[PDB]
Amino acid sequence: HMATLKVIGVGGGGNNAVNRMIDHGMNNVEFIAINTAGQALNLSKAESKIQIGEKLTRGLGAGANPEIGKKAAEESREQIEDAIQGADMVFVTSGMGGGTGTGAAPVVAKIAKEMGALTVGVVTRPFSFEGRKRQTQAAAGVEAMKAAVDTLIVIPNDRLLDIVDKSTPMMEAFKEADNVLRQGVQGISDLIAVSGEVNLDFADVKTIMSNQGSALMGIGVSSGENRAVEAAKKAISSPLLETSIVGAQGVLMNITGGESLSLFEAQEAADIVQDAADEDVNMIFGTVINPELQDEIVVTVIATGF
Ligand SMILES: Nc1nc2c(ncn2[C@@H]2O[C@H](COP(=O)(O)OP(=O)(O)O)[C@@H](O)[C@H]2O)c(=O)[nH]1
Ligand SMILES: [K+]
C-alpha cells in the first residue's frame, strides 16, 4: 500500500533531465520518456518510452512549434494513459519555449490529473539570450501548465547564470537545475516510506499540493551548531526558483535527524519558515528520527498557497 511515483520527461530538456536523474540513481520511481524526436528517444535511459507525432514529424522534432507538440500528444493520449496507469503522483518535467515541451507537456499533465494523480510540473523558462519570441512561447506554455497541474515549479534558466563562475561546465549547471526535481522527488519518496515520530503520509502531500498553483520545493542539510536554522534557511532560499517562499500560505515541512533532534531546534527551523513566508502559514509538520544520522539534520520544505 505504498504510493507510486513517476517522472515524465517531455521533449528534449525533459528527456535530458530524466537521463541525468537515472544516471544519478533514483530508486522506487518509474521514469517515462515522451518525445517527437526518435533519435533522442532511442538514446533515452527510461524504462518506458513513448514516441508521439510520428505521422506528424516523421520522427524528427516539432522544430520549436508548440502546436505540433500539442497535436502529437493529444493523438497519443491512450499510450500516455497506459504509461501513467498505476501512478499516485506524477512529475512532468520539460523545458518551455520549444515545440514539444511547450505543447505536449500540458497535455501530459492534464492526462495525469484526470487519472487522479497528484500532478506536479517542474519546467524551465528559456535564457534571455534565446530571444523574446522563445520567452513568449515559454510563457504561454507556463500558463498552460498551470491550468493542467496541481502545482507548478518554474526554473528560469537565467538563474543558472547566477550560480556559475566563468568556467562552470554547462552540464554541471544543468545538474543544479535537475536537483530541484530530483531532491523534491526524493524528499517526498522518503517522507512516504519512513514512518516518522510526528508522522506525515502521502495524504498530507496531497493536502499541500492538490490544486494549488505555484509551488516551492526545497531541501537543506546541515550539521554543527545552529544546524536546524541553517538547514531550514537552505531549504527555502534556492537562487534558481521563480517562486520564492514569500507569501507562501501552505507549507509541508519535515525534519529528519538523529536521536539528538531537540524540540527547541525543531521550533527554530519552523519559525524560520513561518517568518520568511511573512504570512501566517498553514504548516503540516513532521519529524523523522533516523539514528544512522549523527549530527546531520535534513529539512524538507514544500510550499504552496501563493
Ligand atoms: N535547464 C535546462 N534547460 C534546457 C535543457 N535542454 C533544453 N533546455 C531549455 O528548454 C527549452 C526547450 O528546448 P527543448 O526541450 O530541446 O525543446 P523541445 O524538445 O522542442 O520541446 C530550450 O529553449 C532551453 O531553454 C536542459 O537540459 N536543461
Ligand atoms: K510516513
Author numbering: 10 to 315
Which passages does the manuscript contain on this structure?
FtsZ is an assembling GTPase that plays a key role during bacterial cell division. This widely conserved protein polymerizes in the presence of GTP and metal cations into polar filaments that gather at the center of dividing cells to form a dynamic Z-ring. First, GTP hydrolysis only occurs within the filament, as the complete catalytic site is formed at the interface between adjacent FtsZ monomers. We report a dozen filament structures of the FtsZ core (residues 12 to 316) from the pathogen S. aureus, hereafter SaFtsZ, in complex with various GTP mimetics and metal ions.
Our structural studies identified D46, Q48, R143, N208, D210, and D213, all conserved across species, as key residues for subunit association or GTP hydrolysis. Mutations D46A, R143Q, N208L, D210N, and D213N all suppress SaFtsZ assembly as monitored by light scattering and polymer sedimentation, supporting a prominent role in filament formation. In accordance, the crystal structures of mutants D46A and D210N exhibit altered configurations at Region D. In the D46A mutant, bottom residue Q48 shifts 3 Å away from the K+ site, while the whole top T7 loop is distorted, underscoring the relevance of D46 in the connection between the top and bottom subunits in the vicinity of Mg2+. The relevance of this crosstalk area is highlighted by mutational analysis showing that D46A, N208L, D210N, and D213N, all impair filament formation in solution. In agreement, the structures of mutants D46A and D210N exhibit an altered configuration around this area.
